[PDB]
């Protein structure tokens, strides 16, 4: 099926194509494991394209930067698709030169943290250097061009030995953060607030986009050493992160999606936002655009086979015949992630 | 022929099995010449007549009032788990069980084969929509009786060719196979506490 770039209506269900370099440049951040194998396997980086997917990114054209920042969100069931139709998105309007903020899963963060920090400047909040760390090495890679160009209009303290003043770029923030790793969280937060103040201004095109948002008003894991479970409030980095999805400002987009297989005491099979989110969620998060996601169609269907015929990943004898497609059909349920699975092994 | 207990209560005598295998044995010498009128009379007194029967029993479809459409309502009984499978001989391929899809609630793989199996092998896979209820045991034992009762709901809308082969393929008859009660004295049914020679 035939592409050029992203953005194209009749181009439903057709396979657009990105390089190694606009991938290692668009997502320094982690893409989805099955699909980062799908690319390191194929040698060639392939997608098709969906109605929602369509659908948003029109949204996404008709922006008005004036207005205060617009929720999205993805919602569908387990392995439907709606992690790879928020990076379309990511990639389309990174090529489009903009701020992308990019959290792969947030359950990262509420879920398996070695080091939970102590830090009671935020008046008993706990960092997650591990987890900063590692979002801010992608982050530097992600907009090189914009972290030169920032200028915080800020005093900001890192140590009794060291500080900096205003009039500096972002970058130097940033990577000032990863060298000293200790206070690496802190200076997320701060790159955060920053942004979101600097966003006023039309240098800054902001997409903020979180996968797993349910793991903002979540249960936690964690714990203290008394055993007590701790709060997703008294996490700095989800703390500073909520205040990225409050609609206080301008410039900004946020295209946001409901997990349930990274979520927390949560039933594996509820794919609804008000379950995942919660009252709590549900409520702090005001009106958005409910995008479903789901199965693919016939058409799609018969998309993804030529897609994978064409590479030759069917390896068995007999998966080109039509008998081949009514089974991988009714295996899948024409289910994305399902046959995703009923491939590989085929 | 007569058993040998036939014959026991047609003489009002005991026998022996030579006995009886003589006289029978003297029949086949009757049978083997020119039979006479008295001569098949005669023969007729030591004769008897046995019934066979094999057909899977044909449900006439149903036609609902509703869509004023065609359907036939299955019933699967397997091992603790009892299914009924409603059909719909018009289909998107909709396939719902207990009020949710079928993906949702065989999340093995294994199993949505096992329901593949009938409507694979009558290559209805697309046409007919299904309408399931299930109730005890686990998975696997579900999965199986979902089987059981469509093959046995799709007997309606097949020939009457294709039955005698979905019970040569084994799909319509029950399975037989349960638990075995442990006896006591004993661990496992058939697994023996651990006897001791010495
Ligand atoms: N060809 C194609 N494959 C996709 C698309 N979206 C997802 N996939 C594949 O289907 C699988 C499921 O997608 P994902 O968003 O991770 O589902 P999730 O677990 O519910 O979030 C992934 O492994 C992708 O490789 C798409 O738009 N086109
Ligand atoms: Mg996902
Ligand atoms: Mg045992």
């Not at chain 1, 090189?144 to 770029?169: C, D």
């Not at chain 1, 050493?225 to 990225?244: G, V, Y």
């Not at chain 1, 004898?317 to 059909?329: D, I, M, N, S």
Request: contains cysteine; charged residues 25%; proline residues 4%.
């Amino acid at each position: 099926x035939x592409x050029x770039x992203x953005x194209x209506x009749x181009x439903x269900x057709x396979x657009x194509x990105x390089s190694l370099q606009e991938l290692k440049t668009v997502f320094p951040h982690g893409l989805p494991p099955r699909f980062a194998m799908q690319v390191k396997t194929f040698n060639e980086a392939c997608l098709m394209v969906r109605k929602p997917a369509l659908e948003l990114l029109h949204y996404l054209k008709n922006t008005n930067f004036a207005h205060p920042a617009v929720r999205y969100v993805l919602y569908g069931e387990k392995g439907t698709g709606k992690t790879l139709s928020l990076c379309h998105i990511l990639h389309f309007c990174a090529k489009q030169n903009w701020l992308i903020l990019h959290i792969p899963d947030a359950h990262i963060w509420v879920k398996n943290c070695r080091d939970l920090l102590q830090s009671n400047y935020n008046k008993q909040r706990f960092d997650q250097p591990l987890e900063a760390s590692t979002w801010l090495k992608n982050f530097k890679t992600a907009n090189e061009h914009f972290l030169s160009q920032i200028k915080v209009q800020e005093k900001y303290v890192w140590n009794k030995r060291e500080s900096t003043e205003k009039g500096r770029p972002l970058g130097e923030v940033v990577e000032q953060g990863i060298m000293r790793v200790r206070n690496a969280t802190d200076a997320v937060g701060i790159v955060l607030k920053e942004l979101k103040r600097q966003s006023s201004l039309g240098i800054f095109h902001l997409l903020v986009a979180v996968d797993g948002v349910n793991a903002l008003w979540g249960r936690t894991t964690l714990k203290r050493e008394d055993k007590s479970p701790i709060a997703p409030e008294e996490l700095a980095l989800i703390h500073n992160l909520r205040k990225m999805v409050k609609n206080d400002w301008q410039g900004g987009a946020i295209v946001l999606t409901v997990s349930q297989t990274g979520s927390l005491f949560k039933p594996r099979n509820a794919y609804l936002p008000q379950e995942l989110l919660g009252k709590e969620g549900f409520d702090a998060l005001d009106p958005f655009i409910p995008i479903l996601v789901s199965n693919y169609n016939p058409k799609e269907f018969e998309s993804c086979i030529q897609y994978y015929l064409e590479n030759n990943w069917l390896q068995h004898e007999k998966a080109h015949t039509e008998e081949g497609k009514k089974e991988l059909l009714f295996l899948s349920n024409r289910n994305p992630g399902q046959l995703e699975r009923l491939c590989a092994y085929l | 022929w007569l058993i040998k207990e036939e014959l026991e209560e047609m003489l009002v005598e005991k026998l022996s099995d030579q006995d009886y295998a003589q006289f029978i044995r003297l029949l086949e010498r009757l049978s083997a010449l020119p039979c006479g009128a008295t001569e098949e009379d005669f023969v007729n007194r030591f004769r008897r007549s046995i019934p066979x029967x094999x057909x899977x029993x044909x449900x006439x479809x149903x036609x609902x009032x509703x869509x004023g459409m065609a359907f036939s309502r299955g019933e699967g009984k397997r091992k603790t788990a009892k299914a009924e499978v409603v059909v719909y001989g018009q289909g998107s391929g909709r396939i719902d069980v207990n009020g949710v899809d079928y993906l949702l609630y065989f999340p093995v793989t294994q199993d949505r084969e096992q329901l593949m199996f009938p409507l694979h092998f009558l290559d209805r896979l697309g046409k007919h929509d299904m309408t399931c209820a299930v109730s005890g045991g686990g998975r696997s034992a579900q999965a199986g009786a979902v089987r059981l009762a469509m093959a046995r709901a799709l007997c309606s809308f097949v020939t009457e060719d294709e039955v005698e082969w979905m019970r040569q393929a084994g799909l319509l008859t029950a399975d037989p196979r349960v638990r075995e009660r442990k006896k006591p004295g004993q661990e496992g049914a058939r697994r023996k506490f651990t006897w001791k020679k010495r």
